[PDB]
Each structure stands twice: as structure tokens, then as C-alpha cells.
Design a binder for this molecule. Structure first.
Ligand code: UED
Ligand code: UED
Lengths: 306, 306
């Protein structure tokens, strides 16, 4: 009963959040095994951020210039390296709360949970989606960098995101845990464009399937459509083109509810052309695109983790 | 930058979730010190739930009839009692992961985080509000009972909610940690009415203040109003009557943004009478009422916890 935008239990990630200062800049770090990961602009002064030469800036930095604090105790830095836009601080103490983890470069349209932190302490947890334009719509203030996004599979934490900056439009940009930015973004204080953000069409359809499962069915029509004719409406409304892979991913939900994918596409077509007439679906007046088909199955069947 | 419905870090609560079975019924329990708290209908069979006599049902139950599992190890039950609609199972082992905690009966309009669990294992975490009619709009399936709602103050966990049942309208009902139901609800399988749910007016105003802080200002008008004239619009649109206490709680946000409370009430009045004209505020097409004034200050200033 009910459908909510819920996030993973963040307990396994809270144990990995540390505080990292270099000079006057302080941000968060990810402590896994004997390595601490954090954005590389921790070495930047307020002036350096306009056009930083990270190679020249890092060279004037030694191990003792990095203050890594895990709660009450410090970590002795015994090595540092720069991998893309992230620093890897080698410490002498392995994190005893290190969970089973791996690094994953997420795909556009997929979702993950963000644990927003400040000064190495967690502040909150929320669910976001990697937009098609490789941005996210999160809640990040000054000091939030180094906060990580992740997914949980039973006991395996798949880290996929690390926050770095906000764009002029208010959306946020970051990297994977190997330091590669999602999108055409660079870690420099300059006006960067994210481009036209389209709607994750497969996610909208999966959300409409969750609505029928929960009792909202007023949007179910008596029409059908073709992939090509739907994508003619989709492209006009800045929606992702639907593919046969997208149809196959929506397969299990289509068989469960007995509603063909193309029939659900026709219901979504009328919604784009006629609006919503002041009505709501699952308590929303807009078409939600931050629930993937796997997020619908997980919440509607009660999948748990460690 | 950005405003999201974020939940507290659930790490301190994950360590307290256990599994409780009595007969064939299995639900979640809250393990604090040497006591396990769980809903009392764990002693009910599928037939008993229609009209249970918990006094007569509990009397035929002994300590060994309660299977309390905390992950891989069992807890030896050495005592049981019934406090209102919750059972207090005394165990021989104090939970080593017990955080600083206390029990709080939340007020209508306040918010808290829910950690949805199944079989004693966390499944997800989301933020909800205690509606004026003492219901919540959560995501709860079969097996979710015993899941708890809570707030975190630095290192103190204030447990305030325990899930018990869903209503015919799809909303959920539960108790405090002393077993007293929020609302006129009883733990029995029967059609129970929740009454007219009104909108938390002070929460809507605090959300509009968060919008101005984040850049959404199109709803700011050039009118003003009186508490009485606003409440004339409020009562018509099923909104909570605004009081001087509500104005005082919105004080710090009013002084921060330089917008008088009554002026913000006038902007909210026009929104109720004219709708939204297909526009969005903070990415929503509806007026959000699940952010309290304290939830706005916390997210817009970066308050952290342990
Ligand atoms: C790191 O904590 C911080 C996060 C920002 C601060 C406010 N909201 C956020 O998401 N990121 C930065 O300070 C970043 C540093 C660069 C070296 C990457 N700069 C940044 O986010 O500037 C915002 C901006 C840049 C250019 C045009 C408009 C805005
Ligand atoms: C406990 O896990 C369960 C939670 C329900 C199951 C589906 N969604 C939920 O929130 N609660 C119950 O099973 C509860 C047991 C009573 C003894 C309190 N009964 C219940 O929720 O029944 C739902 C209902 C009752 C009457 C009319 C319409 C629906």
C-alpha cells in the first residue's frame, strides 16, 4: 500500500564518511579499506577555483597537508595521488566498518541514493536519478562536496557518484568514484551548460505501472499506439525515445498488470497531449521519471537488504 | 542549492531492527536495551484479526512462543507484557548497538523518517508527516508492521511511530512507542474512517519560504491579507487555521527572506484561488505540506547529526 520515493538504508555508508581539510577548504571523504576518496578541489584556495591547474597545485602539497578526521580520531596520511578529479589519500588505518563494496559507473536514467554530508557527518539521505543530461536534482550546500551516491544489493554497496559542484540552473554535477565526471563537466568555477534535459520515458511508464498496482487507474484509456507514433509524441515533449530494450525491461510489469506496454504508451500519449485536468497520479500532479522499473518491483514486492 | 524531501540517516535505527514471530505471524521489532517492542497483533492468527481479544489471546502465550531473531542469533525471551497495542518482550541480552534514545508522542503536522523493514531487515527509508487526521502516507506492504518512525537530534533518536495497519483509503495508521494509537484507530481488521484530512498550512508556508530561498519567486504577489481573511480561504480549501503561534514559528524564515508572514499568506491565497497555471514551485505542481519550518531551516543551513 502506497508508493514513496524511498532511499536505501544509509547505515553502511555512514561508517565510511570522514572529514578532509587541505589548507582552509574542508569537504567530505569516503573511507574504504586504507584509502580515502575525496574531490581534488580540496587543494584549491578561493582564488584557485576560477582556473585551477591541479597538477601544479597538488605538487606543492605533501601528506601532512591533508587533515583526515574520522569522528574523533585522525588518520595518518602516508600517500596521495590524483585519479582524474578525485584524490586517493592512502592512510595507515583500514576502516573497520568497510562494507562489501565496488565502484560502478551508473547509466543515465538509473537511480541511486545520496547521503548528504557536511564536515564528515551525515545530514540526510534522499533518492535521486542520473538525468539523461548527466546531472542530478539534489540538495547540496557549501561543504557538501565528497558526498556519495550509491545503491545497495543485499550487503554490497555500489558507489556510483561523488558530488563536486552546482550548475547555474541549480542542478548538480559530479563524478564516479574513479574521478570521471558524468557529462561534459569540469571541476572549475565557470558557467557550464548541461543541455536539454529530457524525461526518462521508461521510468515514467514504470511509474504508471506502479499506479495501477496501487489503485490509480483513471489514466487507463481504450487506445493503443506504435513505438514510432509514441516516439513522435515523445520527441515533441522532450521525452527519451522508447526502444525494444525499454519494452523488454517493462515486460514483467506488463505481464503482472495485464496491460500491454504499447497500451500504456497510449495512456501516456493522451496525458502528454491533454495534461492531467487537475488530477493526480500517486499523489503527484506531474509525470514522475525518477522511478526505474527495478525501483517499482523492489518497492511493490518488499525487497530488503542487510 | 535545491530542495528535496530527505530523511534522517537511518544507521542508528538499523542496528535496532529485529525479527519477531509468534506462531505463523512474522513482523519487525525494535530492540532497545534488553527490551524488544513490536505490535501486539503478532499473536493473532489470520482468523483472530477480525475481532481479537488480545487479553484472552496473550494469556495462551508463553515466553518461548516468541521467536526473536536479530540477524543470525536468537534472543532468549525472559518476560512479556502488553502496553496498549504494543508488546514488550524482555530479553536476556542488551542490544550493544543501542543509541541514545527516548520515546516521543509526535504532534499532528510534525514530520519524521520511517525505516520500512521486512523480516527484521531494512528495505528503505523515507520522510513522512503526521497528517492532521493522525494518518500517514507511507509505503507499507504485508510484513511491514513493527517498522518505526523517528527523528534524530545529533545523537539522540526520538522514536515516535510504529506501523500497525493500512486504512481502506490506502493511508496508514500506527502508534507511539507506548502503544497508544495516533487517531481513533484500533488494531482490528475492520473498515475504519480517518475523517477529512486537512492541509498543514504552516508547512505549506514554510515550503514557500524555501522556494524563495532557492530562487522560485514567481508566486510572490503584491497583495497582503489578515489572519482572519486568510483563514476564510483556508477553511474553504480544507487548510489548517493559521494562528499566532504558527506566525511565530514562521518568524525566523520571515525575517531571513524579508517577506512578512501575512504577505506570504496573500501569495498562498492567490495560489488556492487561481491554481498554479501549469507552473511549478520547487519542481512540484502541488502545494507541499510535509516540510515543517524546522525542516526548511535544517536543509537550507546544512544541519548534521552523529
Ligand atoms: C563543494 O562543496 C561545492 C558544492 C556547491 C556549493 C553550493 N552548492 C554546491 O553544490 N562545489 C564547489 O564549490 C565548486 C568548486 C569547483 C572547483 C568545482 N564550485 C561550484 O559549485 O561553483 C558553482 C558555480 C560555478 C560556476 C557558475 C555558477 C555556479
Ligand atoms: C502489518 O504488517 C499489516 C500492515 C498492512 C498490510 C498491507 N499494508 C499494511 O499497511 N497490518 C495488518 O495486517 C493489520 C492487522 C490488524 C490486526 C491491525 N490489518 C490491516 O492492515 O488490514 C487492512 C484493512 C483492514 C480493514 C479494512 C481495510 C483494510
Amino acid at each position: 500500500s502506497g508508493f514513496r520515493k524511498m532511499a536505501f538504508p544509509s547505515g553502511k555508508v555512514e561508517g565510511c564518511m570522514v572529514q578532509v581539510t587541505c589548507g582552509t577548504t574542508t569537504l567530505n571523504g569516503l573511507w574504504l579499506d586504507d584509502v580515502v576518496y575525496c574531490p581534488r578541489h580540496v587543494i584549491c584556495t578561493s582564488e584557485d577555483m576560477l582556473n585551477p591547474n591541479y597538477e601544479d597545485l597538488l605538487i606543492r602539497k605533501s601528506n601532512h597537508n591533508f587533515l583526515v578526521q574520522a569522528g574523533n580520531v585522525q588518520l595518518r596520511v602516508i600517500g596521495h595521488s590524483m585519479q582524474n578529479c578525485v584524490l586517493k589519500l592512502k592512510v595507515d588505518t583500514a576502516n573497520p566498518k568497510t562494507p562489501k563494496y565496488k565502484f560502478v559507473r551508473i547509466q543515465p536514467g538509473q537511480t541511486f541514493s545520496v547521503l548528504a554530508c557536511y564536515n564528515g557527518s551525515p545530514s540526510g539521505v534522499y533518492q535521486c536519478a542520473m538525468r539523461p543530461n548527466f546531472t542530478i536534482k539534489g540538495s547540496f550546500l557549501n561543504g557538501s562536496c565528497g558526498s556519495v551516491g550509491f545503491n545497495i544489493d543485499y550487503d554490497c554497496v555500489s558507489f556510483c557518484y561523488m558530488h563536486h559542484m552546482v550548475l547555474p540552473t541549480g542542478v548538480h554535477a559530479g563524478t564516479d568514484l574513479e574521478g570521471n565526471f558524468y557529462g561534459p563537466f569540469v571541476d572549475r568555477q565557470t558557467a557550464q551548460a548541461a543541455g536539454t534535459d529530457t524525461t526518462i520515458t521508461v521510468n515514467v511508464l514504470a511509474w504508471l505501472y506502479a499506479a495501477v498496482i496501487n489503485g490509480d487507474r483513471w489514466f487507463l484509456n481504450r487506445f493503443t499506439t506504435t513505438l514510432n507514433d509514441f516516439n513522435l509524441v515523445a520527441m515533441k515533449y522532450n521525452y527519451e525515445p522508447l526502444t525494444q530494450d525499454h519494452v523488454d525491461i517493462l515486460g514483467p510489469l506488463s505481464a503482472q498488470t495485464g496491460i500491454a506496454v504499447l497500451d500504456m504508451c497510449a495512456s501516456l500519449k493522451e496525458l502528454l497531449q491533454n495534461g492531467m485536468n487537475g488530477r493526480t497520479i500517486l499523489g503527484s500532479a506531474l509525470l514522475e521519471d525518477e522511478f526505474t522499473p527495478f525501483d517499482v518491483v523492489r518497492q511493490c514486492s518488499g525487497v530488503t537488504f542487510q
